[PDB]
Design a protein around this ligand. Structure first.
Ligand SMILES: *[C@@H]1O[C@H](CO)[C@@H](O[C@@H]2O[C@H](CO)[C@@H](O[C@@H]3O[C@H](CO[C@H]4O[C@H](CO)[C@@H](O)[C@H](O)[C@@H]4O)[C@@H](O)[C@H](O[C@H]4O[C@H](CO)[C@@H](O)[C@H](O)[C@@H]4O)[C@@H]3O)[C@H](O)[C@H]2NC(C)=O)[C@H](O)[C@H]1NC(C)=O
Ligand SMILES: *[C@@H]1O[C@H](CO)[C@@H](O[C@@H]2O[C@H](CO)[C@@H](O[C@@H]3O[C@H](CO)[C@@H](O)[C@H](O)[C@@H]3O)[C@H](O)[C@H]2NC(C)=O)[C@H](O)[C@H]1NC(C)=O
Ligand SMILES: *[C@@H]1O[C@H](CO)[C@@H](O[C@@H]2O[C@H](CO)[C@@H](O[C@@H]3O[C@H](CO)[C@@H](O)[C@H](O)[C@@H]3O)[C@H](O)[C@H]2NC(C)=O)[C@H](O)[C@H]1NC(C)=O
Ligand SMILES: *[C@@H]1O[C@H](CO)[C@@H](O[C@@H]2O[C@H](CO)[C@@H](O)[C@H](O)[C@H]2NC(C)=O)[C@H](O)[C@H]1NC(C)=O
Ligand SMILES: *[C@@H]1O[C@H](CO)[C@@H](O[C@@H]2O[C@H](CO)[C@@H](O)[C@H](O)[C@H]2NC(C)=O)[C@H](O)[C@H]1NC(C)=O
Ligand SMILES: *[C@@H]1O[C@H](CO)[C@@H](O[C@@H]2O[C@H](CO)[C@@H](O)[C@H](O)[C@H]2NC(C)=O)[C@H](O)[C@H]1NC(C)=O
Ligand code: NAG
Ligand code: NAG
Ligand code: NAG
Ligand code: NAG
Lengths: 172, 318, 317, 170, 171, 317
C-alpha cells in the first residue's frame, strides 16, 4: 500500500492468472492474450522465502528447567518461580506479535515495489511510442502484433522501428 | 485500429486469508502460513529420546528401593515420566527439601548403584517392617540398612569410607523418628539419638524427633531422608549414637541432559523431538501454544492461539 | 492567461513536537502523543478492587489476633495495604520463614476462621500476659491458646482432628521459649518441652530453647509461630510434652487474585483499575514510570520518563 | 523515503485547517485552496490502528514477588532483584525500539500518500500539463474553477483540452 | 525496494572515490565525472545516528546472581540457571532482529536517495531530455562543460534550450 | 553531435562485506562494522574500579581472620577477585547458608571491623589450636574468641550490647562441635552446650552435636559460623551454656555497588570500565560474546559471535 500499485492505480487483481504472480494482458487486432512474468514472480517468491526460513529456523533446545506447575502452596520460592515463567511467556508473546506484524507490512510493501518497478520499466521501454492511463494500462500508438507484444514482454523491444508511426498518431 | 493496449496486473484468488499488519488489523492476503502449533497428538513418541515410564512409582521411591519399584534398579533415562496414579508402599517417610533431591536425581539420568562393604560393629542390621512387605515376609527399603540394638547394647558407630575414584559419589541415608520414649529406648539403648554425616568440607547432623503421628500402613513413626555427595579424593565419616538409617553404597551421579516430567499420556512407537505433558508435538513452526512445559527441541511457548504470516500480496478481487 | 497553475502540498502547524525515529534523534512532527504515564494522583481509589487498610496492623498481627488488631477478624480483601506506622503490642514473637507465611495469607485473600473443639485434658487453658493487654487486665493472641500446668502435673497431650471437609485447612500453632530453666518448670513441670504437629504426609517437631532475650514489653521470653496444612481426607495430630501454644481452629484458605502492598497513600472515593504504592494511575497508556510495584490492569514499567509516538507528518514550516 | 515532504515539495502550508493534503491553484479568476479527503482519511486511518494496536490493554497481574526489601538476606534477595532488573531492562528496550520503528514508518507513509496524490494528478493531466520541479503543475490550457474542481474530484477529461494544451505546449 | 541499485542502474561505478553518488557525462569536449555531496551527506547522516542509537551505552550492572556453580544443589540453582538462560536467549533474539531490521532499512534508504536524485533531474530537464532505461539521460541539445555543471548545481534553465531540444525530439 | 548524455550512478568498492537482512541471508554491502565483541585483553584493569586480589584467600577467610589472610584486615574494594588456588589454613569450619553470607559481605564492599568490650565472667578466653598457627605458637581466627572453662566451672553467660550508632552492625559468631563426649565435658563442664544469640526482633539458637569428623589439620571437630544484624536503636543479647565461639566486635556494613568475581586473570595497570573473568573488554560495542559474568559498564551478553551492521549501499560490480 506504500507504493500505490496494489489497491491503487491498478484497481483490481486478475483472478485467473494461474501461471504467475505478475503478468501482461493485451488487446490486439489479432485478439486478446495473457502472459506471465517469471522475473517479478521469482523475485517476490525468493523474498517471501528466506523471510520464511529466517523465522522458521529452529533455535530452541532445552532439557532440564524449573518446575512450572505446583500442587502445594509454599511461599517465596514458588512466587519467584511463577513470576519468572510469567515474565518469560509475556516477553516472547510480545516478540511474536511484533514480528508477525512487521513482516506482514514489509510483505505488502515489497509486492507493490515489484509491481511498480515492472510498470516503470515498461514505461522506459515504451519511451515515446505510448502514454499512460491511470488504470495501470498502456496505450500503444502503433500496430503491435503478437510478435510485437512478445518482444515487449521479453524486453527486446525497439522503439526506433515504430517511433514516427506513434508520434504522428499521438500529436497531430 | 492503429493502436493497441497493454495492461499490467497481479493475480487474485477466489479465497484469501486474513493477517495482521502494523497499520491494519484485518487485511486479506492471497496466501498465508500458520506460525503457532496448537495441537498435540497425545502420544508421547519413544524416539529419539529414551523415555522411561514409571507406572506406579515416583523417581524417589524407585531410587530408595520400594519393593513394588524393584524393576527400576540400575535404570537410565533421558526423560522420566511420573504418572498421577503412582503410590508408595513402604515405610512412611518424608524428604527435607524433596524437590531438590528429585531435581538432581532427574538431571543425573541414572540409578546405577554400587554396594560398599560397610562394617557396623555391635548392632543388628537388615531390619524390616510389616508396612513394607517383600512377598509374604517383612521387608525394608533396599539400598538402606535399618540398624537396631544387638542384645542389650547399642555401641557408638564411627565408620569411614574414602572416595578413591575419579567421579562423585551420591550417598543416601536417613534418620528414624520414634513415636514414644519407650520405643526409642527399645530400638536404641540411648535415650536421645544423634546422626552425624560429614566430609572434609561439609557436615550434617540430625536429632531424631519423638511424637505420635497419624498411622500410615500401621506405623506411627517416620523416617527422614538426606543425601551427601563425596568428591574424588574426599572421605565420608558417619558417626551415630542411634536412630541411623545407614546406606548400602553410593549412587553414581552423572552430568547430562536428562530431566523428569509429569504426564498421563500414553507412549507410542513414533518419532518426535519435542515432548510436552499433552504429548509430542512437531517442531516445524517457531511457536507453540500447547504447554509451557517442554522437553527437547521445541517451539517457544506463546499466549496466542494463532499467528498468520503473509506469503503473498494483498487480495483485491472485484 | 491561457494557462493555469496547480500545486499540491501538506499542512503545517505553528508548533510541532519532537519525536525519535531510527535514522534521527530530534525530528519535528505536527502531532504526537505520550506513551509513558509519569504521574500519580496519590489517592488510592477504592473501586473496583476491594482495598483493606490496616491502619496500625500488619497482616500477620491481624491474622494472629493482636488485641489492637481485633477489628480485622474474619476480614477479606482484594489488596491489603500495610502502613509504615504499624506496630506490635502483644507477646514478643518471631515467625521462621515470615515472608512465605505473609505471602500465602495475602494470596488467600481472607481471614475467615472456624473454631474447632479441641480437648486438652489435665492442663489449664486461656493463658494471658501483661505484655498483651485486652483492656485493663492480661490477655493473649486470639485464635491461639496458651496451655500451662494444672496443679503439679503437665500430662502428655495426644489430640487429633480429621479434615472431613472438601477444602484445605490452615492451622497456626506456636512454641514458647522460656528465659530460665525455672520458668520452664513453673509453667510446664517437665524440664524439657517438645511439640510435634504432623499429618499423614508431613511432620514438624520443635524443641524449645531456654535463654535470656531482649526485654520486649516486659518479657524475656519468645514465641515461635509455625503453620501446617491439612488436605481433605487427611488428619492432624498434635503431640506435646509442654511449651505448646495450641490453635483454636483453622483458617479457610482460598485461591484467588488477592495480594498485599506497602504504601502510605490515602484511600479516597474514586474508580481506578491500577494501584501503585504512590497511588492510583490511569491505564490508557501502554507504559508507566511511576513504580515497578503494581496491582491490577496496569501499564508495563519502563525506565524512560517520556516516549512520544508520532501522529502526523514531519513539520516543515 | 519517497521525497515529497522535506523534498521536492520544499515547504508545508501553515494554514490548511481543512485537511492534511490539498490543492492550491492560480487561475484567471483568482487563487484558491482546497483539501483532499481521500488521502487525509487514508493517513488518519493508518496512524489510527497503529495507535490502537499499541494502546490496547494488557498486563493484568495481581500477585507477584516482593521488589523492595528492608533486611539484607543474601541469595534469595539477589535472585529476586536480578529477575526484576532483567525484566525492566528488556521491556525498556522493547518500548524504545517500538517507538523508533513506528515513528519512522509514520514519516514514510505520509510521504507515500503525498507522492500517491501527486502521481494521481499527473496521470489525470496526461499531456495537458507538465511537472515543474516544485510539486506544482503548469496546465497549458485555460482551466476555470469548474475545471479545477473536476481535477480535484477525479472527473477530469484530457480529451477536451488536449489539442489546446498541445498547441500552447509545443 | 525502489529499484535503483540492483535495478534500472545495472552496475556500480568502482572508481568514484569522491562521493557515494555522482554524475558521468559524455560530451563533445570529453567525458567527465563528478560527485553529489547533498545525497551522499544525507545518506551518511542517516547511517550515522542509526549507528549512534545502537552504539550508545545502556547497561551498568555491579552485583548480580552467581552464574557458575561447583556443587549440585537443586531447586535454587535450577532457578538461577533458568533465569540466566532466559535472559541470554531473549537478548540474542533482540540483537538478531535489530541487525536484520536496520540492514533492510539501510538498503532501502540508499535506493531512495538515488531514485530521488534521478527523479529530481528528470523533473529539472522537463522536455529538453528524456529517459533511456539505464539511469542515463539523452539530452537533445548541445551541453558544454559549464552546461553540465549548471545541471549538477541545480541552476539549469530549460527555456534557453526548449525550442532546440523539442525540434530534435519531434517533428 | 548536437546531443549529450548524462548518467547517474553510485560508487562500488573492489571488496564488500556479507551482512544479513530480513529478505536475504547473504548480501554484499560496501561498508559494515562489527557489533559483537568476542575478545578480551586477558589483563584485568585496575581502573577505574578498585580491584582487590585475594591471592590465596577467600572473602570469608579474610573476613574470619585466617592467619595467612591477616593482610586483608580493614580492606575495601569495588571488585573482590577470588583465585582458584585459595585455601584455608585454620580450624576446620562450615558456614550454613555459605553463599548468602559471601554475597552480603561482597556487596558491603568493606571489612571495616570495630572491637567492642565484651565481658565474659568466669571463663578463660583467647583459645587456640595447633591447626591454626600464628608463627611458632598455636593461634585462632582473629575477630573470634574461643571461650573455655576456667578451673573446673563453666558459668552461664548473659551479656548485652546496644546499638547506639546510626548504622547497622554485623556480628559474626560460632558454635563448636566436639568429637567425643569426653572432649565436650573436658572443655565445658556441661554435657550439652547451647548458644542463643537474639535481638529485639530475631533469635537464633544452636545445640551443638558430638561426633567424629574427617581429619583436617589434626582436628576431628568442627565450627559452625553464623551471623546476626542489629538495627540502630536495637540491642544484642548472647546467652550461652557452652560451646560458644564469641565475637570480638562488629563489622560496619555499607550499601554500595561492590561485588565479587572468580577469575584467574592477572591484574595490570590500565583503564577499562568492564571486567569479566577472562579479563577486561572494551565497551565500544552494544553486544559481547566473551562471558556472561560482567562487572561495570559492559555490553550485553549474546550467543552470536558476529553481527555485522551495514553502513553502506549494496555492492554491485
Ligand atoms: C573415627 O574414625 C575416624 C576415621 O575412621 C578417625 O579419624 C582418624 O584419626 C587418625 C588419627 O588418630 C587420622 O590419622 C592421621 O593421619 C595423618 C595424615 O592424614 C592423611 O593425609 C596425609 C596427607 O595430608 C597422608 O600423608 C597420610 O598418609 C594420611 O593418609 C597423620 O599425620 C597422623 O599421624 C599419626 O602418626 C604419627 C606417627 O607418624 C603420630 O605421631 C600421630 O599421633 C598419629 O598417630 C594420623 O595418621 C586419620 O586420618 C583419621 N581419619 C579420618 C577419616 O579423619 C577417628 O579417630 C575415629 N574416632 C574414634 C573416637 O575412634
Ligand atoms: C494418639 O492419637 C492417635 C490418633 O488420634 C492414635 O492413633 C490411632 O491408634 C489406634 C490404635 O490404638 C489405631 O486404631 C487401630 O485400628 C484398627 C482397625 O483399623 C484396629 O484393629 C486396631 O486395633 C487399632 O484400634 C488408629 O488407626 C490410629 N489413628 C491414627 C490417626 O493414627 C494413637 O493411638 C494415640 N496414642 C496414644 C498413646 O494415645
Ligand atoms: C540477662 O541480661 C539482660 C540484659 O543484659 C537482662 O535483661 C534486662 O532486665 C532488666 C530488668 O531486670 C530490664 O530493665 C527494665 O527496663 C525497663 C525500662 O526499659 C524498666 O521500666 C523495668 O522496670 C526494668 O528495669 C532490662 O531492660 C533488660 N535488658 C535487656 C537487654 O533485655 C536479664 O535480666 C538478664 N538475665 C539474667 C538471668 O540475669
Ligand atoms: C513513587 O514512589 C517511589 C517510592 O518507592 C519513588 O521512588 C523513590 O524516589 C526517591 C526520591 O527520588 C528516591 O530517593 C528513591 O531511591 C526511590 N526509590 C525507588 C525504589 O525507586 C518514586 O520516585 C515515586 N514516583 C512518583 C512518580 O511519585
Ligand atoms: C576493502 O578494501 C579496502 C582497501 O582497498 C579497505 O579500506 C581501506 O584499506 C586500506 C588498506 O588497503 C586501509 O589502510 C584503510 O584503513 C581501509 N579503510 C577502511 C575504512 O576500511 C576496506 O576496509 C575493505 N572492505 C571490505 C568490506 O573488505
Ligand atoms: C565505514 O564505516 C565507519 C563507520 O561505521 C567509518 O568510520 C567512522 O568514522 C566516523 C567519523 O566520520 C567516526 O566517528 C566513527 O567512529 C568511525 N567508525 C568506525 C567503525 O570506524 C569508516 O570511515 C567507513 N569506511 C568506509 C570506507 O566507508
Ligand atoms: C500457499 O501456501 C500453502 C501452504 O500453506 C501451499 O500449499 C500453497 O501451494 C501456496 N500457494 C501459493 C500460490 O503460494
Ligand atoms: C495441555 O494440558 C494442560 C494441562 O496441564 C491444559 O491446561 C492445556 O489446555 C492443554 N492444551 C492442549 C492443547 O491440549
Ligand atoms: C493529536 O492526536 C490526538 C489523537 O491521537 C488528538 O486527540 C489531538 O487532538 C491531536 N492534536 C492536534 C494538535 O492535532
Ligand atoms: C572465557 O572464559 C570461559 C571460562 O570461564 C571460557 O569458557 C570461554 O571460552 C572464554 N572466552 C574467551 C573469549 O576467552
Amino acid at each position: 500500500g506504500l507504493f500505490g500499485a496494489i489497491a491503487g492505480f491498478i484497481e483490481n487483481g486478475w483472478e485467473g492468472m494461474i501461471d504467475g504472480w505478475y503478468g501482461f494482458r493485451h488487446q490486439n487486432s489479432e485478439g486478446t492474450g495473457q502472459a506471465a512474468d517469471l522475473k517479478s514472480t521469482q523475485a517476490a517468491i525468493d523474498q517471501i522465502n528466506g523471510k520464511l526460513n529466517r523465522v522458521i529456523e529452529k533455535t530452541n533446545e532445552k532439557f532440564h528447567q524449573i518446575e512450572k506447575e505446583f500442587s502445594e502452596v509454599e511461599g517465596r520460592i514458588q512466587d519467584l518461580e511463577k513470576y519468572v515463567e510469567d515474565t518469560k511467556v509475556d516477553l516472547w508473546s510480545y516478540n511474536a506479535e511484533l514480528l508477525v506484524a512487521l513482516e506482514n507490512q514489509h510483505t505488502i510493501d515489497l509486492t507493490d515495489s515489484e509491481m511498480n518497478k515492472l510498470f516503470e520499466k515498461t514505461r522506459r521501454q515504451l519511451r515515446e511510442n505510448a502514454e499512460d492511463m491511470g488504470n495501470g494500462c498502456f496505450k500503444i500508438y502503433h500496430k503491435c502484433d503478437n510478435a510485437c507484444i512478445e518482444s515487449i514482454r521479453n524486453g527486446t523491444y525497439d522503439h526506433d522501428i515504430y517511433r514516427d508511426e506513434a508520434l504522428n498518431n499521438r500529436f497531430q | 485500429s492503429s493502436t493497441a493496449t497493454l495492461c499490467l496486473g497481479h493475480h487474485s484468488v477466489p479465497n484469501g486469508t486474513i493477517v495482521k499488519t502494523i497499520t491494519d488489523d484485518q487485511i486479506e492476503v492471497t496466501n498465508a502460513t500458520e506460525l503457532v502449533q496448537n495441537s498435540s497428538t497425545g502420544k508421547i513418541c519413544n524416539n529419539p529420546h529414551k523415555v522411561l515410564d514409571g507406572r506406579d512409582c515416583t523417581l524417589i521411591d524407585a531410587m530408595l528401593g520400594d519393593p513394588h519399584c524393584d524393576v527400576f534398579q540400575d535404570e537410565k533415562w533421558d526423560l522420566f515420566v511420573e504418572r498421577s496414579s503412582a503410590f508408595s508402599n513402604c515405610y512412611p517417610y518424608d524428604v527435607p527439601d524433596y524437590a531438590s533431591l528429585r531435581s538432581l536425581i532427574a538431571s543425573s539420568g541414572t540409578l546405577d548403584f554400587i554396594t560398599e562393604s560397610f562394617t557396623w560393629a555391635g548392632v543388628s542390621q537388615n531390619g524390616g517392617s510389616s508396612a513394607c512387605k517383600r512377598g509374604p515376609a517383612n521387608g525394608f527399603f533396599s539400598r538402606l540398612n535399618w540398624l537396631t540394638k544387638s542384645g542389650s547394647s547399642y555401641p557408638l558407630l564411627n565408620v569411614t569410607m574414602p572416595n578413591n575414584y575419579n567421579f562423585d559419589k551420591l550417598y543416601i541415608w536417613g534418620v528414624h523418628h520414634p513415636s514414644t520414649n519407650q520405643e526409642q529406648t527399645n530400638l536404641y539403648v540411648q535415650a536421645s539419638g544423634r546422626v552425624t554425616v560429614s566430609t572434609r568440607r561439609s557436615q550434617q547432623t540430625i536429632v531424631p524427633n519423638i511424637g505420635s503421628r497419624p498411622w500410615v500402613r500401621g506405623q506411627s513413626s517416620r523416617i527422614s531422608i538426606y543425601w551427601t555427595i563425596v568428591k574424588p579424593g574426599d572421605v565420608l565419616v558417619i558417626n551415630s549414637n542411634g536412630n541411623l538409617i545407614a546406606p548400602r553404597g553410593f549412587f553414581k551421579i552423572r552430568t547430562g541432559r536428562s530431566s523428569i516430567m509429569r504426564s498421563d499420556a500414553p507412549i507410542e512407537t513414533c518419532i518426535s523431538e519435542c515432548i510436552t505433558p499433552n504429548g509430542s508435538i512437531p517442531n516445524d513452526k517457531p511457536f507453540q501454544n500447547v504447554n509451557k512445559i517442554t522437553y527437547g527441541a521445541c517451539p517457544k511457548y506463546v499466549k496466542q492461539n494463532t499467528l498468520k504470516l503473509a506469503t503473498g500480496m494483498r487480495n483485491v478481487p472485484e
